[PDB]
């Protein structure tokens, strides 16, 4: 009975992955969820923030305190829910990878890493079909010259570990010659099988 339940789920997942364009193969591994307590998540968050601040210091990149929390400042003191820690750990790993790639582009300032909350964080405003993948939105803002902005676009596009799609870019006066960039993105999380104890 619980055997057939698991069999149904595993065959559902197998068909879900199979229906994907084989171009998504390099992105599938990192979508696997790692068991994570809320505290383990908070620790990984604070370590990533320390590494990022240190790296930006070494590279002469200014980074606001809100940016350095990688879109997860709400969990700097309050731990996330037990149900959401895995998924947040995925999104945190992805954003950490993305921001470090951007840190290699010769930018001059990281201004904002804004991350709308995912459904699983809020049970409040919520056994059929599961989507093959789900988007996770975020918006980043940074400042740099044109050379670095083009490098940043390419850095996002060339990523092989996490799939971020670029929904829009806006260029404004600064907040060589500096420009202020705001990028609206979706992180793609590929559907995972679930199995209760």
UniProtKB/TrEMBL annotation:
It comes from Akkermansia muciniphila (strain ATCC BAA-835 / DSM 22959 / JCM 33894 / BCRC 81048 / CCUG 64013 / CIP 107961 / Muc). The keyword Transmembrane helix applies. This is Uncharacterized protein. Keywords: Membrane, Transmembrane, Transmembrane helix. The lineage of its organism: Bacteria, Pseudomonadati, Verrucomicrobiota, Verrucomicrobiia, Verrucomicrobiales. It comes from the Bacteria.
């Amino acid at each position: 009975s619980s055997n057939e339940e698991l069999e149904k789920e595993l065959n559902r997942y197998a068909k879900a992955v199979g229906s994907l364009e084989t171009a998504y193969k390099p992105f599938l591994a990192s979508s696997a969820l790692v068991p994570t307590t809320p505290t383990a998540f908070q620790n990984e968050l604070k370590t990533f923030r320390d590494s990022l601040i240190s790296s930006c210091k070494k590279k002469n990149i200014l980074i606001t305190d809100t940016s350095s929390w990688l879109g997860f400042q709400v969990y700097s003191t309050q731990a996330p829910s037990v149900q959401a820690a895995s998924t947040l750990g995925f999104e945190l790993k992805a954003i950490n990878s993305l921001v470090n790639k951007l840190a290699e582009c010769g930018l001059s300032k990281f201004i904002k890493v804004y991350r709308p909350q995912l459904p699983i964080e809020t049970p409040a405003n919520n056994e059929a079909d599961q989507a093959p993948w789900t988007p996770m939105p975020l918006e980043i803002a940074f400042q740099g010259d044109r050379e670095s902005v083009l490098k940043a676009m390419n850095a996002i596009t060339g990523m092989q570990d996490y799939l971020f799609t670029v929904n829009s870019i806006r260029i404004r006066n600064e907040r060589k010659e500096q420009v202020f960039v705001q990028v609206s993105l979706n992180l793609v999380h590929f559907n995972q099988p679930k199995a209760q104890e």
